[PDB]
């Protein structure tokens, strides 16, 4: 149950290693990926980033999946964080549905060369 | 190709090869031979000498100390290391408690006739002593000027990391090195678990038994030679390993590696040792030698190091068939 | 990547020196200006100020420009902070537009002496 | 105009002028002359004497120590400083590792016949030793009563700041001084980078070679005089610098400064030294002297200090044409 300390622009967070290891492909879940942010003098990982957002990022691991955006954090800022911590497109897409979005489908041109040329001005 | 390397990420510079004293000093070889071995090593630029309270019940430390005192070498040009854990038959004379670490080191220093060792090691992990007590005790002997640095031996990476975090928590001194067994037939720990620690917390590796006690030398390809370590009284376990099933398989593979040695232009021992030094995570390799011939030959492993290309290493892995999974 | 610690009435913030150096003319970006707030005993800069606001001030540097007022911080209080940290009128004006304002233009009196006297009561 | 100054912001009070021992002690001059120099300095209120393990391979420290012991001056009235880095040909006898700092200082103290120095300096930065180890080692020798304070030498402001933050992080002792080269032809570091550190973390500057080894004295205006430092065996590098292109340009400018000296009523050396003391960031200037005449003349720089008005300094900058950009 080795503990892990994560320092977000001064805001201190702690959790258990097994909590992060729950999601092996993320940044904090992969030892090789987080290695870059480790501070051997303070035994902590340091990220020069947005503080309000991280509370949710960590809870995502603790809750085993729940990725809620804090009410007080802009959607554009939070999304950038989600991508930085590499939570993955599955959880991101799942995040956008709840944040009210989804969809974004619809085939393109005909593909029949000329048939896809008329289907444009009509 | 750099003869001297930093031990892990500390400022202590050690020769990539060191000379140990297990079995030999105050045991198998004579004091005159031990003196001849140390002199050859020292004169060849080796500054690292390893010993332990447990070796020959303290006689290895007495012999090493007598040579240092007799030769009059400047203390500042030597890097002496000693390990602590087994120091007596009494219940309180073993382990990594504050009591034994201080009493053990003090007694080792008295036998070595030295004011301090450069690195004191916990010879092995102690399930019975809180990490805090151990780290505080190591820190105490360093602040008392009895040692310059401390390290672990036979500890898992989990335990080494623990010693490190406990050190940060209480503002103590973290270990700078792990003395792990490493050779062509024992690679898991050093190749899979220690590299992360070297990059993350600067812990380097000082590996022992590079020739698996002589097994990897090739001298046992056809039985137990007279006067070899496996023949010595008290080393029946070693003989058994060599004559066992797995034993023959190893000797079979050593014969295949013999071809690699010739292509590289070196002896098998020179290849086995140079091989241990291919990873940057390995700071130094502790050599064992029962006579001057072996030492002179083994030191030659340094010329082989530059020849260990990706191709050659991959071939050696094919022959060994024991490359650890990452 | 020398780290910098900023203590806001007890609330601890950390960032990299190069993050603040991004905006050389601000208070925290200019070594001569922040010098006054440095505490050599704790190796940190101390400001006896409003805590809720600073999260945004630091993010402004981290994001390289984004100056959003926290939802929970009054506009009058936040504006005072923006001026104290000397973020500059360009970012302040840019801040007011987003905070919904802009405008505030319109020439004055005629300037023709008497012509600008009639243009008053009409 | 204050003869005594605090070294940086510490409580250690040093005379604005100090006497060093590089080249001279145990080297160029005789032990009797060294004794004559120290006595003159001491009797004139100078309490700061600098040396180094590397000067004359430790002989400078032996000579300084013999004088202190022979004269019987109260230890509490002296401020002895020694630098550590190059202490031997062995790999482990150089650098700022914990091993060399403790062994180096202990050996310097033995040669100096002193229980402790007032300030121990890292003679230069060590890219090979973690700052933590160095700061912890400096802190250790201070807690052991081997030194009262510690400082850096030839370190960048980035490195000095690092030593300071590592000290705060682990509750260790921060350096209080940087020994930087400073004279009319080497001004960048002291005038542009060290002032921020002096105001921010209290690090003061103790500058060396105020006359650029004699170059700024004016004695080389027309060739290498006999018995001058540039003529000495082993100092070919100095001779080359003086006879080079840049060398003639400097001597040309020294001739222009000669007019400034006369307007101020002093000798060129007295002006060059007093000039180094114009900034409050400079705590003290370490003087070099091969004979008693030079020392007596140089100490006179203190009367010039009050005359260095804004106008005069700006004129000197015009002549030098090397004022660093802020
Ligand atoms: N837990 C620990 O930390 C730990 C444990 C064990 C050892 N160590 C260190 O590592 C060192 C021992 O390494 P090691 O001695 O066990 O394995 P090696 O692989 O270091 O063993 C060398 C021994 O094998 C034989 N040998 C070596 N080179 C040879 C050559 N070129 N030709 C023929 N025979 C050769 C020698 O003669 P013989 O065959 O006649 O004996 C010698 O006594 C010790 O000094 C000790 O300090 C540390
Ligand atoms: N890295 C470091 O920390 C470091 C490095 C170097 C020095 N230092 C310190 O700074 C001190 C040395 O300063 P320095 O000796 O290199 O430059 P100075 O500028 O201190 O050099 C003085 C030398 O130049 C000549 N000189 C001095 N005054 C003179 C005068 N009035 N008239 C004619 N000649 C005169 C002398 O005779 P000669 O010309 O015959 O020699 C003398 O030996 C040392 O004692 C040392 O402790 C520190």
Numbering used by the authors:
A (entry chain B), C (entry chain B): 32 to 153
B (entry chain A), D (entry chain A): 36 to 361
What do the authors say?
To further correlate the ion distribution in the crystal with trans-enhanced dissociation in electrophysiology experiments, we crystallized the channel with a mutant toxin, Lys27Met. Miller and coworkers had shown that Lys27 mutants reduce toxin affinity and abolish trans-enhanced dissociation. Lys27Met CTX indeed inhibits the paddle chimera channel with reduced affinity (∼630 nM) but still forms a complex at the high concentrations of channel (∼20 μM) and toxin (60–80 μM) present in crystallization trials. Electron density is present at S1 in an ion omit map, compatible with the presence of an ion, although the density at S1 is weaker relative to the ion densities at S2–S4, as if the occupancy at S1 is reduced. Thus, it appears that the ability of toxin to interact with ions in the pore (and thus alter the ion distribution) is directly connected to the ability of ions from the intracellular solution to destabilize toxin on the extracellular side through interaction with Lys27.
